[PDB]
Amino acid sequence: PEPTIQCGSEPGPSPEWMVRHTLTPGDLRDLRVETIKSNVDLEDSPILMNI
């Protein structure tokens, strides 16, 4: 765990770079997403992605 991450808002490529025209190979599984409650025990909280 020696390297950690410092994250910020960055310019990225045009969103066409995400439009694959073939099938994605099903075992390219390095990236996962699941939703998390921002404030637990609290009701109407924003829902965040944990990528």
Partner: antibody, heavy 117, light 107 residues
Framework: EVQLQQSGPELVKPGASVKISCKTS????????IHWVKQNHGKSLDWIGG????????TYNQEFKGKATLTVDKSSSTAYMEFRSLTSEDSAVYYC??????????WGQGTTLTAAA | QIVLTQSPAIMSASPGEKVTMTCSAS?????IHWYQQKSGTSPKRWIY???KLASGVPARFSGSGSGTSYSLTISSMEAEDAATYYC?????????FGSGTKLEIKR
Amino acid sequence: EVQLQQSGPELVKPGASVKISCKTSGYTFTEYTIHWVKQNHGKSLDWIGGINPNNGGTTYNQEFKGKATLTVDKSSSTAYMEFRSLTSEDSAVYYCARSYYGYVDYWGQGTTLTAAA
Amino acid sequence: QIVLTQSPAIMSASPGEKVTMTCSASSSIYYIHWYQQKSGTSPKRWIYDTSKLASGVPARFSGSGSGTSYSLTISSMEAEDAATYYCQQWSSNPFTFGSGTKLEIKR
């Protein structure tokens, strides 16, 4: 239970085209890729290609490009494969199969295609 | 473009002996999957994601490996194991199968 039910066998003159079907049930059709696999009698398994039923996107083994075409019909939860100009080398069992990641978890029962003059 | 080379192509084992078969990828893959096929039926998922057993598959089977080298191992051969075993990758297009290891019973 998940089931993939394929159309029945076809005996065909060399040079004809055929379209076989793969009827899926028991899951949300659009969430899983459908694959097609050729197996000559007693030999190895050859991937023909796959189709995403959500957007109709396809990818082929280039030895089958042009020869095979994959389609789906979401309303019937059915996948189709069209093989053109059959030769005697195309006589084989043809399977449809379901994946989510890179492996296949359910297989159809197979469709025999026979080329005979 | 990844091709999978399986060895041995054909082999026999007596019930109770240890069995190993290998699957070698022309370049690196994220996972390997194995299917069992007996004459006259569809292949069945056997080991997937390199080392996981599909439900019901006997625990005498195990998978291991990484990078380009993978193997399927049977700790103790049983007669119900005689079959052809195919490995398979879909880390790159096209989806590919290995040429298969046909496992027969020595007597």
